[PDB]
Amino acid sequence: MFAQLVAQNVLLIDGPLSWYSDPGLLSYKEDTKELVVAKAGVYYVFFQLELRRVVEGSGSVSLALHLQPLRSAAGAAALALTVDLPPARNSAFGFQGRLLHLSAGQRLGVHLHTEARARHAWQLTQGATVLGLFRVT
Amino acid sequence: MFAQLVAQNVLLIDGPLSWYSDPGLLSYKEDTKELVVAKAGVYYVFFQLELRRVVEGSGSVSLALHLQPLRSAAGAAALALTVDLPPARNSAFGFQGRLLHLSAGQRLGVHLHTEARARHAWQLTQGATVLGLFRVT
Amino acid sequence: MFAQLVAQNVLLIDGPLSWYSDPGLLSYKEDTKELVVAKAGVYYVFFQLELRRVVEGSGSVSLALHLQPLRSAAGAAALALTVDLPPARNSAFGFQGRLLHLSAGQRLGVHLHTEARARHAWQLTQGATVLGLFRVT
């Protein structure tokens, strides 16, 4: 039991990422942009983000994995990655992984936020933003 | 067979980290600040460190995983992470993982060192320093 | 089914890395500098690169994992890591992992490229460049 998805998005538009199964290799829902877990268990979950400067912009970008229905109003992220974008090093890269208890039926969604002096200046390297997981149980 | 711990420490005081089991989810010893492995085997082991600037400080911070009783006077680290702190990007982040042969009964300890022009200026983001592992055997 | 290799190379010479089994712990071929996979399956594959400034140089360094016989003229990398080297932070570090479908008999090779204003100025920290993997199947 495992999965790996690649993000379609290259432009830095805030909100949830759209995914597609990895060509290289539970299921995805294109309508809500939500991965859904079938088997309950402890999963190793990782994601990865590359950025390329395509110009003189700066700031930071954030990925956050949110689990299904929130189950609290607090809205905590199960996984979160921050990457700073230098002003004029034309690339930036983040990797993070950890163990997660996931429930049978639990939807997963990934959100991108960018607080930058130029959201136009950088963009995601196409094919280089990946969410992967496998069951340790 | 797996585990994941979160560091209590936010202040940058040198010496061994204090841990607690992840709320999200072999055993820990609070007295010596040492995780202890029950089953022998090859484990994937990872740790993760986030830092936040809370001011104009700089330098670097280091995490090192040391295995149990040293078994040599050399004192080599099984796992080690270095993160540089820029002077006035208000955050810094390190992730590292690798495969380790671990012995039944082996204690694990994690040490933090900081060589900085202001140890007061940065601190660990609370909940964001994690040590995790699972058996590949 | 797993493996972990450490790179012999410390100097920043372009081309394929030479490896050796991890002292800490399918097979390696010293003649072609190629790891070879025995059992078919989905593997979690990771690599790691540390760099140390040993002087006033700058630029970037790249690792790329290429799979066996190319099977296309395109020559895409299954795994790729980029690390920028600041001019006068005396260290740099990259980690990346993802899930890969690997074929029985498939050779793996890792290539290092450096585009730098001084390839002489930085070098790989000895023992700190690692390629590891384990089967998720």
Which approach determined this entry?
X-ray
Fold of A1-137: Jelly Rolls (2.60.120)
What residue segments make up the domains of chain B, in order of their start?
1-137
Distance between CA atoms of A80 and A97, rounded to whole angstroms? 9
Whether chain A has a CB inside 8 Å of the CB on C105: the answer is no
In Å, what resolution does this model reach?
Answer: 2.7
Cβ-based contacts of A25 with chain C (< 8 Å): 42, 99, 101
Please report, to the nearest 10 degrees, the dihedral formed by the alpha carbons of residues C25, C51, A87, A114 taken in order.
Answer: 0
**DSSP 8-state assignment for residue C120:** T
**Chain A residue with Cα closest to C136:** A134
Distance between CA atoms of B64 and B109, rounded to whole angstroms? 8
Distance between CA atoms of B56 and B121, rounded to whole angstroms? 7
Q: Which of A42, A84, A94 sits opposite B25 (nearest CB)?
A: A42
Task: Mark yes or no for CB contact C97/B97 under 8 Å.
Answer: yes
Task: Mark yes or no for CB contact A44/B134 under 8 Å.
Answer: yes
Asked whether the beta carbons of A3 and A128 are under 8 A apart, the reply is no
Please state the separation of Cα C83 from the chain's center in Å.
12
Strands A34-36 and C27-29, sheet pairing: unpaired
Q: Which of B91, B93, B132 sits opposite A99 (nearest CB)?
A: B132
Distance between CA atoms of A23 and B40, rounded to whole angstroms? 37
**Chain A residue with Cα closest to C48:** A95
Query: Which 48-77 residues of chain C touch chain B by CB within 8 A?
Result: 48
In this complex, how many residue pairs, one in chain A and one in chain C, have their CB atoms less than 8 Å apart?
A: 38
Strands A107-116 and A34-36, sheet pairing: antiparallel
Length of chain B: 137
In this complex, how many residue pairs, one in chain A and one in chain B, have their CB atoms less than 8 Å apart?
A: 38
Identify which of B130, B118, B124 has the alpha carbon closest to the alpha carbon of residue B52. Answer: B124
Cβ-based contacts of A48 with chain C (< 8 Å): 96, 98
DSSP A11-26: S--SEEPPEEE-TT--
Write out the two tokens for B53.
């600037």
The amino acid that residue A68 corresponds to is Q
Identify which of A54, C135, A84 has the alpha carbon closest to the alpha carbon of residue B92. Answer: A84
Strands C2-7 and B79-85, sheet pairing: unpaired
Question: Phi/psi at A112 (nearest 5 deg)?
Answer: -115, 130
Task: Mark yes or no for CB contact C48/B98 under 8 Å.
Answer: yes
The helix/strand/coil state of C47 is: strand
Task: Mark yes or no for CB contact A86/B89 under 8 Å.
Answer: yes
Q: Which residues of C60-98 are buried (b: 16+ CB within 10 A; e: fewer)?
A: bbbbbbbbbeeeeeeeeebbbbbbbbbeebebbbbbbbb
Identify which of C37, C23, C14 has the alpha carbon closest to the alpha carbon of residue C130. Answer: C23
Radius of gyration of chain C (CA): 15
Planar angle of CA B62, B66, B67, nearest 5 degrees? 165
Cβ-based contacts of A99 with chain B (< 8 Å): 2, 4, 22, 24-25, 132, 134
